[PDB]
Amino acid sequence: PTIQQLVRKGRESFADKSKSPALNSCPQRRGVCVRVYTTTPKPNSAMRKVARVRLTNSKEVNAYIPGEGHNLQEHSIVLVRGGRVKDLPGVRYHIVRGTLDTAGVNGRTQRRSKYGAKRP
């Protein structure tokens, strides 16, 4: 545009959206397991364990449960962090293992800190 056009109007800059809006600019939130169910991936064909959780920030979302073997159930207090799964539409949050009701993965000897397992 011309210099006078820029003087009259100016330039407008948008705002980048946050990839985890339900956290409300927090690292982790606390919730209760409203529902525990299983979903199918959008060329994978697995059975991924998910929980619908109502967070304390007045919001309900879906959180994936990483690892093999979950002791969670309905109406369980869990810690929810960011991070999405590529081959699953919907879910965009993870459940921290080893915190609150969620227990660490049993029989883990590698990648222990990502699944909350102590040194054996």
Partner RNA sequence: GAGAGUUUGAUCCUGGCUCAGGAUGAACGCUAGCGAUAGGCUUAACACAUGCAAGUCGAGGGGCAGCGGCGACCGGCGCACGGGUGCGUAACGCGUAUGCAACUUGCCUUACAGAGGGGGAUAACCCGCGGACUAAAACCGCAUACACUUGUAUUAUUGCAUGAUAUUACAAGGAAAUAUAUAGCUGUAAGAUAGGCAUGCGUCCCAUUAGCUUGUUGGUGAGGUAACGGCUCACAAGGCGACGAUGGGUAGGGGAACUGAGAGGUUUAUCCCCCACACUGGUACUGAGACACGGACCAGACUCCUACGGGAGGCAGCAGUGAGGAAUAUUGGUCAAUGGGCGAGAGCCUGAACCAGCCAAG
Partner RNA sequence: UACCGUAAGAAACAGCAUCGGCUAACUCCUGCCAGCAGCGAUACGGAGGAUGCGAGCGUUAUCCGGAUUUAUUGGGUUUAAAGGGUGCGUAGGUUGUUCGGUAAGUCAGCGGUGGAGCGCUCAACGUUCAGCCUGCCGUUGAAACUGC
Binding residues for other proteins (CB under 8 A) = 3-4, 6-7, 10
Q: Report how far apart the first and last C-alpha atoms of the chain are (Å, whole number).
A: 67
Give which of 33, 72, 71, 39 is closest to 55, Cα–Cα: 33
Q: x/- binding map, residues 57-96, to RNA, per CB under 7 A?
A: x--------xxxx---------x-xxx-xxxx-------x
User: Which one of other proteins, RNA, none interacts with residue 58, CB within 5 to 8 A by kind?
Assistant: none
Selected binder of RNA within 29, 51, 63, 95 (CB under 7 A): 29
Largest CA distance in the chain: 72
Residue with Cβ nearer other proteins (1 or 69): 1
Q: Which position has the token pair 């919730």?
A: 31
